Design a protein around this ligand. Structure first.
Ligand SMILES: Nc1ncnc2c1ncn2[C@@H]1O[C@H](COP(=O)(O)OP(=O)(O)NP(=O)(O)O)[C@@H](O)[C@H]1O
Ligand SMILES: Nc1ncnc2c1ncn2[C@@H]1O[C@H](COP(=O)(O)OP(=O)(O)NP(=O)(O)O)[C@@H](O)[C@H]1O
Ligand SMILES: [Zn+2]
Ligand SMILES: [Zn+2]
Lengths: 413, 413
């Protein structure tokens, strides 16, 4: 039924979920939504209605092979301005993935791409200073790394507005994003055809005077090679990648053929940012450790080790669903690490040491990693310890001297 | 005759054997079964009846070339829900391998794939702690290694239930197993076609949001490359491999093209497990060393060296087939080694030293190898020394200081 699918899509748009999952078990079908970073169960619908709405979603999808193919895997895309499903204006495009499940079952995954203050989202002040210093440099390449729900596009858009303000419209800015998402310059619009179109758009942007290229993501190795050659040509590149800890970026680049002599130059690789998104506790409804352990308190030994020393400072989510917010959580915040490479740091990284290179960054360069930022926001009470240790590993490995140094540097500023 | 083959399959299912071997010598045919880890002789059947039942098994098999091909090698598969042989519900699929044997003889091998408490199967407490620590980490790749009868699928299923309990259904779990074996998430279902289907299923699982990928085995190099790229993308992988001693995993990976820069990072390779299955003595019927040597005692010099120091503690199988159990053995237990890699350990392994790297793991990392666990279960009396030295080599090479340290660490806990 088209109507039930339309109501489901409107409900998911108004509730602002990220992904939608539908699992059919031939008795009852589970409908799950991905709100913020955690998954939750939406509904237990009937199997026949779920099969009907999945069939309708496949039929009104733009890509279809005229076979439902219960036993076979399928992919499809629904694009706005041509849709009999009467899509809401909030959702621009929906990417549907259909998978077989057991015997006569279906698994539908929907990505729900959306078509929709100047600074200090969740970053530290040192990260803001590094961002300003990186924006002041005319020549270089910047790479943003993290998992899928990092929010790299929002950071790139905010940096683009900051470049608008700072540069006084004296430079040319080009933006090459195949899916138009959010206001952002010249917005330049199967998988192989999309990749070929993206490569053609990048080449056409390079034929003109790009100054700042601002590419969208980096899937292919040829794309990254073209971006690197344009960066050594004399332009500025702000790209995004999938990596961890702001040092696996080099591992993700050497896998595709960037070669070691390009990554050694500190003038080329201007900055590296690795960020993650975690849920933020509501400020109106927060409880102390004693109030948390008073009613159903569950704390592990590592969590107790992290809290120890600042037991009164930490905060926990408040149950009972008070008037403010929804469930004691108010949005999300970014924990990030920003590195400005040096000659010695890049020389140590290129040798593949992986030891005394992170130490050099933390001690000599006065750098801060993602674990220290997560611990600082744990002590400040902005985020819960359980969410931080679920998202990030290694928080309990911070030494006492490092914690004392971080507290001293936070108090002296 | 279909009836005799049906009775043979029912007998093998009720007796719970692993593999079935039929050898034809044109005078009398040997029927052998693989119960637990050891092979034994089931029956001495007539050659004509064996040829007839093998011909019937080939004819009712799904794959057939309409030629019996006595002189040629053949392979076939029998799948449930489409079988004129009236398969028992316990057996899902049977893989038949037919080989020539001498002049006019046949060799049939049947794998007998079966379609069918929360922790502490045979693992040590340190292994359980390492398992919990590995389950707490959000990003990484875990590899389970061992011979064919290790029981890696059972360990992976138990870890999946433990992840169900721990994660509180806040993450998405996908399972990609081409043969559906045992309850386990979204269960995603010639050799080249099967490999292509497996690769397509893995790609389709990667197109959605996998979080935890949980792949089934690793046959091809492209599959392992895709798993590694997904692990550096930011997902978690629990895969199984065929290797020994938890350090030949790197040798099995470098053979297929993982490259050295991917294996150096300790944040990527989160843990390595190598396990084996040995027979456990029945607790009701156990005899001491004196009772064993009283009647038909056969002990070697190396076995005497291993037993020496704890002669009264060891136990031996009890003959005469008492009321309990079957032959003095009660099930099987796992002897395993679990390593959490470090930067120095991975640097030493990547250099190909093979010396002072195992020493670093045993001394600095306080690790325990499979030989020490086997010796500890020998001293505790859970398993027999002969089975342990048949399954595992190098038990007699443990020094006296290491044995004293193991006994002290077992007594202090
Ligand atoms: N402080 C915040 N910073 C960034 N994003 C936030 C923040 N708070 C909430 N969000 C939301 O987090 C969501 C993730 O942003 P998004 O740019 O879509 O991630 P992404 O890296 O582009 N995902 P993908 O393209 O699939 O790899 C955004 O839609 C934000 O609305
Ligand atoms: N403590 C135990 N732990 C694991 N398996 C056990 C144990 N006790 C008995 N078993 C049985 O050992 C058998 C081997 O398990 P299995 O998962 O089939 O090994 P495998 O590694 O998957 N073999 P293969 O796929 O051919 O490489 C299982 O069927 C168990 O029933
Ligand atoms: Zn609130
Ligand atoms: Zn017994």
């Amino acid at each position: 039924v088209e109507k039930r699918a339309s109501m489901l899509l409107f409900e998911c748009a108004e509730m602002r979920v990220s992904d939608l999952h539908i699992k059919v078990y031939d008795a009852e079908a589970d409908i799950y939504i991905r709100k913020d970073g955690d998954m939750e169960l939406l509904r237990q619908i009937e199997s026949n209605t779920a099969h009907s709405i999945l069939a309708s979603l496949y039929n009104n999808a733009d890509d279809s092979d005229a076979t439902y193919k219960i036993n076979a895997y399928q992919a499809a895309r629904i694009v706005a301005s041509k849709s009999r499903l009467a899509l809401p204006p909030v959702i621009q495009a929906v990417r549907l993935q259909f998978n077989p499940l057991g015997q006569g079952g279906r698994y539908l995954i929907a990505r729900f791409l959306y078509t929709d203050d100047p600074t200090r989202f969740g970053f530290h002040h040192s990260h803001a200073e590094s961002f300003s210093r990186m924006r002041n440099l005319p020549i270089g390449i910047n790479i943003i790394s993290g998992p899928t729900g990092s929010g790299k596009s929002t950071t790139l858009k905010n940096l683009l507005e900051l470049l608008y303000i700072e540069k006084k419209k004296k430079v040319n800015i080009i933006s090459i994003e195949d899916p138009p998402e959010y206001e952002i310059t010249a917005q330049l619009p199967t998988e192989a055809q999309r990749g070929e179109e993206y490569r053609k758009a990048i080449t056409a942007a390079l034929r003109s005077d790009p100054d700042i290229i601002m590419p969208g993501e980096a899937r292919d190795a040829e794309v990254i090679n073209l971006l690197f050659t344009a960066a050594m040509t004399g332009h500025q590149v702000w790209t995004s990648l999938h990596a961890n800890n702001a040092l696996a970026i080099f591992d993700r680049l050497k896998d595709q053929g960037v070669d070691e002599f390009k990554l050694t130059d500190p003038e080329l690789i201007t900055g590296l940012v690795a960020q993650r998104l975690v849920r933020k506790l509501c400020a109106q409804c927060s409880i102390t450790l004693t109030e948390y352990i008073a009613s159903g308190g569950g704390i592990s030994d590592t969590d107790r080790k992290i809290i120890s020393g600042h037991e009164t400072s930490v905060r926990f989510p408040n149950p009972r669903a008070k008037k403010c917010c929804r469930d004691g959580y108010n949005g999300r915040t970014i924990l990030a690490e920003v590195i400005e490479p040096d000659s010695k740091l890049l020389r140590l990284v290129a040798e593949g040491k992986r030891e005394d290179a992170q130490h050099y960054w933390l001690t000599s360069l006065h750098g801060m990693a993602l674990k220290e930022h997560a611990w600082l926001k744990i002590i400040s009470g902005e985020i819960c310890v359980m969410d931080a240790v679920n998202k990030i590993s290694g928080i309990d490995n911070i030494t006492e001297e490092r914690k004392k140094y971080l507290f001293s540097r936070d108090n002296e500023i």
